[PDB]
Amino acid sequence: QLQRLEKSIRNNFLFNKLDSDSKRLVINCLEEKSVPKGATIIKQGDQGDYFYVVEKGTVDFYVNDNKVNSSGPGSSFGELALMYNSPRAATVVATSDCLLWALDRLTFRKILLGSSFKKRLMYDDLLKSMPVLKSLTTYDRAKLADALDTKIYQPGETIIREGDQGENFYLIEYGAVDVSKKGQGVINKLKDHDYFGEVALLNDLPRQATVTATKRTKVATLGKSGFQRLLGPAVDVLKLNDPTRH
Ligand SMILES: Nc1ncnc2c1ncn2[C@@H]1O[C@@H]2COP(=O)(O)O[C@H]2[C@H]1O
Ligand SMILES: Nc1ncnc2c1ncn2[C@@H]1O[C@@H]2COP(=O)(O)O[C@H]2[C@H]1O
């Protein structure tokens, strides 16, 4: 029917949110696929063909044959392979028999990456290129991206001040910054693909130094709650690099 569809959409965060042009342009395209309990829907490593939204049924998610996740009706999956052109990041096994609505790679790139996952698209180069972020899987980079805001600082602007409360952690997209400490002047300098602002957040301390743009500098910024959950791999390197130690 066309009522099951208009309900699919009204209840999906990605879709209820598109303009009726994208919205029309997506109910037209959804193909439905039934699947028996015990069928693999997508295999880890495979090329990404489709995006799925679960009408009825339940799935289990396996990363290297561990099992990591679980979803029911309303939930969607298969979006990372298509937005990024990477292999499948997880195997998705059917846990009870299911009816899935499928968007082909082409329409996904047409409507949904354009608009639902805009952020993931924009930060993808930063996140793939930052050294401290190398251990992150595409699923991780995606969750991290959703949480980032962008700020541009100009020459001579203060980004953070020694002694302040910290709230954000910072990833330099391009630019140049000086780190300074009263009594000591400039003690370090950062640039594209450096990060700063973890010491306050890792240790619950005030900011331990002032950071000042010396060129036009674009950062992505991540709040404390996100720093606590979205950097899982990278977090051990941040504690290991932490200048509050020798
Ligand atoms: N822990 C996880 N790691 C990787 N992918 C996951 C995880 N949990 C759920 N997924 C979803 O499972 C899908 C497997 O295929 P994709 O990489 O295209 O998109 C993936 C996500 O949409
Ligand atoms: N030698 C250093 N001492 C203090 N902070 C530094 C140093 N080098 C780089 N920084 C960065 O400057 C940041 C200032 O705020 P935070 O203390 O939150 O986190 C600090 C580090 O990320």
UniProtKB/Swiss-Prot annotation:
- Residues binding 3',5'-cyclic AMP 1 are 14-131
Modification(s) after translation = Phosphorylated by YAK1 in response to glucose starvation. The phosphorylation sites can be clustered in several groups, all localized in the N-terminal part.
Query: Does Nucleus show up as a keyword for this record?
Result: yes
Instruction: Kindly indicate whether the keyword Transmembrane belongs to this entry.
Output: no
Q: Which GO terms describe its biological process?
A: adenylate cyclase-activating G protein-coupled receptor signaling pathway; cellular response to glucose starvation; cellular response to nitrogen starvation; negative regulation of Ras protein signal transduction; positive regulation of transcription by RNA polymerase II; protein localization to bud neck; regulation of cytoplasmic mRNA processing body assembly
What's a single GO CC term here? nucleus
Q: Which GO terms describe its molecular function?
A: cAMP binding; cAMP-dependent protein kinase inhibitor activity; identical protein binding; protein kinase A catalytic subunit binding
Q: Which domain of life is it from?
A: Eukaryota
> Where is the protein localized?
Cytoplasm; Nucleus
Q: What is its main location?
A: cytoplasm
Q: Which residues bind 3',5'-cyclic AMP 2?
A: 132-246
Keyword terms of this UniProt record: cAMP, cAMP-binding, Cytoplasm, Nucleotide-binding, Nucleus, Phosphoprotein, Repeat
Q: What else is known?
A: Present with 4280 molecules/cell in log phase SD medium.
- Function statement: Regulatory subunit of the cyclic AMP-dependent protein kinase (PKA), an effector of the Ras/cAMP pathway. Inhibits PKA activity in the absence of cAMP. cAMP activates PKA and promotes growth and proliferation in response to good nutrient conditions. Together with ZDS1, provides a negative feedback control on the cell wall integrity-signaling pathway by acting as a negative regulator of MAP kinase SLT2/MPK1.
For this chain, the family text in UniProt reads: Belongs to the cAMP-dependent kinase regulatory chain family.
Q: What is known of its domains?
A: The inhibitor sequence (IS) is a substrate recognition motif that docks to the active site cleft of the catalytic subunit rendering the holoenzyme inactive.
Q: How does it assemble?
A: The inactive holoenzyme of cAMP-dependent protein kinase is a tetramer, composed of 2 regulatory subunits (R, encoded by BCY1) and two catalytic subunits (C, encoded by the 3 partially redundant TPK1, TPK2, and TPK3 genes). Activation by cAMP causes dissociation of the holoenzyme, producing 2 active catalytic monomers C and a regulatory dimer R(2).
- The molecule here is called cAMP-dependent protein kinase regulatory subunit
Organism listed in the record: Saccharomyces cerevisiae (strain ATCC 204508 / S288c) (Baker's yeast)
Which residues of the complete protein does this chain represent?
171 to 416 of 416
